């Protein structure tokens, strides 16, 4: 039986942990964006007395850091914060190489191309923006876009003809041809705003969740709606699997991991159960990331902690 176990916990932050990103190149370094305006790059010392130390704090941002992603080579990082600016870092020293100015409101999401050639950003301006990798504005989706906050944008991993997909606060999942930057199709449903969106590594499904609490699976090839999983409380971040057919979902205080084959829950990752003497008892779950080894997942919470969960047999 495949089970999950709490290996260790990482400390060093001061506010909420908002994003976690791992690269398949270096299996011993993690990026963690937090609400204390810093981005911590970790020294993942695999011991068990602790589990990791912050290696370097990428500083320089005037508000919350909402999104971060590592490049394909492991030498750069892209970040998007709540002052409208995007930053291209250097994982060797710091020294933000290029800031991507141009927005009127906070920057929510950020995503990197398959070859790290274009950049995409969604903000609260109801504007999706494409950028050259030199710090200039390539294209802007001004209208036919969402009517509310564009909460998340992602690239498809396919070399076969290219998709980008965006979810918003207008309870819609919109999909775009990347060459043309026009709409391909709509996706209706999801009563309530949308928190996240993701594409499977095979580039064939989009698992979208939000306030509703139900994770919906959409097909990127058929242009239909496959099926729905009621995730229970609420969905913060949905992430697919690197070497399995699961789907990890971040509910309020828990993490729900489905076997998609017969669409059945495998586990409910609940932390410790102190009798919290009033009010909302547990620190809620913000983000989660699967390691390229497919063996351990990292989860960033709202109480300044980053917890590890290892697959055990």
């Amino acid at each position: 039986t495949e089970q999950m176990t709490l290996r260790g916990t990482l400390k060093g932050h001061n506010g909420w942990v908002t994003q976690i990103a791992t690269t398949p190149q270096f299996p011993d370094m993690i990026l963690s964006a937090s609400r204390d305006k810093t981005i911590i790059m970790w020294k993942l010392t695999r011991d068990e007395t602790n589990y990791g130390i912050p290696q370097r704090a990428l500083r320089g941002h005037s508000h919350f850091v909402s999104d971060v992603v590592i490049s394909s080579d492991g030498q750069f990082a892209l970040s998007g914060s709540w002052d409208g600016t995007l930053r291209l870092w250097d994982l060797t020293t710091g020294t933000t190489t290029r800031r991507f100015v141009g927005h009127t409101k906070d920057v929510l999401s950020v995503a990197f191309s398959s070859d790290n050639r274009q950049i995409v950003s969604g903000s609260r301006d109801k504007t999706i923006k494409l950028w050259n990798t030199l710090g200039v504005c390539k294209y802007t989706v001004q209208d036919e876009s969402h009517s509310e906050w564009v909460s998340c944008v992602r690239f498809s991993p396919n070399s076969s003809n290219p998709i980008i997909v965006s979810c918003g606060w207008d309870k819609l999942v919109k999909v775009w041809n990347l060459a043309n930057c026009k709409l391909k199709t709509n996706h209706i449903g999801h009563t309530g705003y949308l928190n996240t969106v993701t594409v499977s590594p095979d580039g064939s499904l989009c698992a979208s969740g939000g306030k509703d609490g139900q994770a919906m699976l959409w097909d990127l090839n058929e242009g239909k709606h496959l099926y729905t999983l009621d995730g229970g409380d609420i969905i913060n971040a949905l992430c697919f699997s690197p070497n399995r057919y699961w789907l990890c979902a971040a509910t309020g205080p828990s993490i729900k991991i489905w076997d998609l084959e017969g669409k059945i829950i495998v586990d409910e990752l609940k932390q410790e159960v102190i009798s919290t003497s009033s009010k909302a008892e547990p620190p809620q779950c913000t983000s989660l990331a699967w390691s390229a080894d497919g063996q351990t997942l990292f989860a960033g919470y709202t109480d300044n902690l980053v917890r590890v969960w290892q697959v055990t047999i």
């Binding site: 919350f64 906070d106 609260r124 606060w169 309530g192 705003y193 306030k211 009010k279 909302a280």
Partner: protein
Amino acid sequence: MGRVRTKTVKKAARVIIEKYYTRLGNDFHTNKRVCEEIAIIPSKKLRNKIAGYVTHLMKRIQRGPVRGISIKLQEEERERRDNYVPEVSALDQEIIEVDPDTKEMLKLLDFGSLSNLQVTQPTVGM
């Protein structure tokens, strides 16, 4: 000290909740932006105070309903209880039964079945 909010803040927060109930959450830094985008507050301090009272109201609406804001989700749970429910049934057992001087009364309007009796101690408090 102070920290007592004014009617201009409380009424604004109550209206903001009663219209945009589904956009508001439990954290302050998001309710701030929501109220910033849905309303027109002509100051930043007032915006923060309104968004801070909205959070304190939301933390309560998750419990029992407050008595100044009416939403749709919390009205159905009243409506669907004000219509009949299987907790209630009919008159609980339809073999209800009486005492004398009621049978003596019922006899004066022609009733004749399905009753009982009892006689008490002869006056109060004995």
